[PDB]
Design a binder for this molecule. Structure first.
Ligand SMILES: Nc1ncnc2c1ncn2[C@@H]1O[C@H](COP(=O)(O)OP(=O)(O)O)[C@@H](O)[C@H]1O
Ligand SMILES: Nc1ncnc2c1ncn2[C@@H]1O[C@H](COP(=O)(O)OP(=O)(O)O)[C@@H](O)[C@H]1O
Lengths: 531, 531
């Protein structure tokens, strides 16, 4: 059989739901090669794995080929771009002929932007003789012995749009940035020949690596292995001997080796939108039980009974507006909305779409909307709605899709009642708003319990006895209160010559009181305009 | 053996920390060629030295090859750009085949922008046949006998972004402009065959050459050697004989020869962002002991106990805002903030980002933020925040990275309390500001002592007896007072026919009192709004 060093299904732990989607796409054509000759159903030829580079997209194709048992030729895009004019088309044709020779098989096109850009972009004519004959060999769809052309690209709007037409590249699956649990899985994978000691736990290590692709996670565990082996075998002065197995197994990576490898800069994945299914429940956001009661009607009630809600002749609401004071848990309530729906989270920000405004990147607005269309089920939180009217126009003209079966919930948060234009206020598009108020006693106490449970908590406080003077201290304001209280705890605790109730109670008798008291009536006139 | 005229490790003195980083990267692949065949760890193939030209990036690769004992091939980018179509790709392929022939070895690609630009930028199609096959021979990663491909470029956003993807060019180290201590080291290097006399001290020479690369420092010591040898050997009328080595050692470069060579123009490094580790202590900035107490909590307390501050579940604050009167040591307090943190200093200015605003160079804003990500540990002082809202948007959308392990401290200084927008003032991003006040009695006395110690000081003054009338005279204002007092010391001291207490005391009885007295309450109402 094949060697175990080849990649298997177990070796990938980035996005296993997308792995299941790829298996659901291509497993039946590949494991069952004759069934499509009997049925009159076209198999999906040409799925397209789009995502950031280094997400392991070659390993997906190699793993599904090696588990399935299909032959795996690889057309690297930069490999056939450097052959001379006419030789590159000839090599592409021989690659597809070799694919059709030992079929069933799968052939990969890594870095299709090197073959096909979105614009023509290249005023020489040998590029169009390369994307042409690739469009022709996309029409290997004769319901043959099955070949599936998996492809890779940096962005799905970076390829030529003639590829996205039907019959050429039909399915378009996002491999996606891995989540924190996927980071735990991939660090658990990347230890089998590294042979860590028991001190390294990798949980907080994976949690500290948010915003990075699987490639530089493999590079950071490799770098930690380099730091662990760099303390020895030259200091031991035994390079002259053979490479000793008991020395390597006696060596182990250490916790501060991982801290060292993380400490050097690894921004191989530039910062982008996030894909995550949160575990943050209703209770972790403080109070808001009437807001819970409305939002259960808004998202939990349609997904508990989609058949009964659709049977009553009305679609579910497209999304709620969060309207009220800024930073009062309204930003983190979308975690509970996604969690109790068991849906994914997208948290694209206001200044991000402002950068799309200033760079005229409304194509990126369309791309993140279609990204939300791809994620299923998911929620589309977006704060700072009053910051933008090109982006308001683009949001309104792209929200017209009616993917209520996708259960996308278009939730937006802003503080300005009517400075934001009433083009959103038209009924049927996005109008079932709610007034999120200032955090009250239960809200402040429960958000203090949640944000103080995650810290070392020597409380010794009745939280009503602490938060009674908070007339309108917001959740952002009270987490800043906890921030400066724990900073004074740092101030009195780290001073030494070489407990925490004191800092809560000096925050209780503190002289810094800053509450936006005048804005509750500013919300209340428009709330009474609702009446 | 190899000749001593070849470059060694001791020859380079520009950025020895980056030299240590390069050694940490490529020493174990090169000094230990067999160890990666047994371990399952990919060595970093293709580190990338980026910096201004003439920083010595060829000498780094030649030095690590010559000290390590690996073969050094050099693919000069302009050299293989001039061959005919298909011949250049053939030469690149034979160069990589020769690299794989006598491996372990290192190959260099100087001026990769001549090979690969950031845009496609060239509507001929032989350039993409040149950057392609370079991407293909980046995939010499078979964990072979190890070859590492060092690369050189002017700017890290000037190469093609397909090179920055993982597996092709992984490590991206800044070779960096040298500091003043590096200038001392490189002028100490450039004297071994020059044979200076004892009058030349080179310390003030190195201090006078801020803003210049190592190339024109070698050119200025060469020019000083030319000035020293240009007074003789034709004036002596002894060119006809053999070149006398005893006369050459009897010849010596002189102090005014260095002044002459510096006096002719050497702008080979155009003015850019600066990289420096200051030694300017807390005492060198006048007073501000309560601001010292806050800033010790802000930067010194996290770096004294990172484990205890992270163990309390709260990240360190991203950076304080200097809020108060302009030019009162707020520009130079970041020197102390970097100094007792033992961190690097970046002092990018407000009008510099205004030139990024007017030229729409937000890519340069991303590049200087990633430069701060590269520098470790460092601080990111940036004044004139009220000058800028595209750049405010870009700063906010790029400051969202959470490199608290890097100990980057996002400090900004401005005088306008609320004219600058509070989008930065949203909590958790950049909110723990402080009110830097006008310099008081201790502050003005200490800044006068520090700025007058560096001058020839015949003080004979009680500094309280001088600065009692300074109601609100700033540190910029009082250094201007010292400036005009020393200019009157010039006025009375150099007049002659062919001491300094008089000028301090006529500054004491001077008739120019210009203090912005009206703005202390303008700061004080917002400071009491903090309450
Ligand atoms: N989801 C994942 N599971 C396992 N390994 C991964 C994953 N993502 C990235 N990697 C690691 O990152 C590297 C990048 O994957 P590769 O497919 O070679 O590059 P690219 O994705 O750019 O084609 C691989 O060597 C792999 O070990
Ligand atoms: N850090 C340094 N140490 C020693 N010499 C240097 C340093 N930086 C620059 N130089 C001098 O400057 C010149 C520029 O170096 P070189 O690598 O030849 O040019 P480039 O960096 O443009 O490829 C060299 O001749 C070298 O002598």
């Amino acid at each position: 059989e094949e060697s175990l060093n080849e990649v298997g299904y177990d070796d990938i732990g980035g996005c296993r739901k997308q792995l299941a989607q790829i298996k659901e796409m291509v497993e039946l054509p590949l494991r069952h090669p004759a069934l499509f000759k009997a049925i009159g159903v076209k198999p999906p030829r040409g799925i397209l794995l789009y995502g950031p580079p280094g997400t392991g997209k070659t390993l997906i194709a190699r793993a599904v080929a090696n588990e399935t048992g299909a032959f795996f030729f690889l057309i690297n895009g930069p490999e056939i771009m450097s052959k001379l004019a006419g030789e590159s088309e000839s090599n592409l044709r021989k690659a597809f002929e070799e694919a059709e020779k030992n079929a069933p098989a799968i052939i990969f096109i890594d870095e299709l932007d090197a073959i096909a850009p979105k614009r023509e972009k290249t005023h020489g004519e040998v590029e169009r003789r390369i994307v042409s004959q690739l469009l022709t060999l996309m029409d290997g769809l004769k319901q043959r012995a099955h070949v599936i052309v998996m492809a890779a690209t940096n962005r799905p709007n970076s390829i030529d749009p003639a590829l996205r037409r039907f019959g050429r590249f039909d399915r378009e699956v996002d491999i996606g940035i891995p989540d924190a649990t996927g980071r735990l899985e991939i660090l658990q994978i990347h230890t089998k020949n590294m042979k860590l000691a028991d001190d390294v736990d990798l949980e907080q290590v994976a949690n500290e690596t948010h915003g990075h692709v699987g490639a530089d996670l493999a590079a950071l565990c490799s770098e930690a292995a380099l730091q662990a082996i760099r303390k020895k075998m030259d200091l031991i002065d035994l390079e002259d001997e053979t490479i000793d197995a008991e020395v390597m197994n006696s060596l182990a990576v250490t916790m501060d080796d991982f801290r060292w490898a993380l400490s050097q800069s690894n921004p191989s994945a530039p910062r982008e939108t996030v894909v995550e299914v949160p575990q943050v429940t209703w209770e972790d956001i403080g109070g808001l039980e009437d807001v819970k009661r409305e939002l259960q009607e808004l998202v939990q009630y349609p997904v508990e009974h989609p058949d009964k809600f659709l049977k009553f002749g009305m679609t579910p609401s497209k999304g709620v507006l969060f309207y009220g004071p800024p930073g009062c848990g309204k930003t983190l309530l979308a975690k509970a909305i996604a969690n109790e729906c068991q849906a994914n989270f997208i948290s694209i920000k206001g200044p991000e779409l402002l950068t799309m405004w200033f760079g005229e990147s409304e194509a990126n607005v369309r791309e993140i909307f279609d990204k939300a269309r791809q994620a299923a089920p998911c929620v589309l939180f977006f704060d700072e709605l009053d910051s933008i009217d090109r982006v308001i126009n683009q949001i309104l003209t792209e929200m017209d899709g009616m993917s209520t079966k996708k259960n996308v919930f278009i939730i937006g948060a802003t503080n300005r009642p009517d400075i934001i234009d009433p083009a959103i206020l038209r009924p049927g598009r996005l109008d079932q708003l709610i007034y999120i108020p200032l955090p009250d006693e239960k809200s402040r106490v429960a958000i203090l319990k949640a944000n103080l449970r995650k810290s070392p908590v020597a409380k010794d406080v009745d939280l009503e006895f602490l938060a009674k003077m908070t007339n309108g201290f917001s959740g952002a304001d009270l987490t800043e209160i906890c921030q400066r209280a724990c900073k004074l705890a740092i101030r009195e605790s780290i001073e030494s010559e070489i407990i925490r109730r004191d800092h809560f109670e000096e925050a209780m008798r503190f002289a810094r009181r800053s509450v936006s008291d005048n804005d509750i009536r500013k919300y209340e006139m428009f709330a009474q305009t609702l009446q």
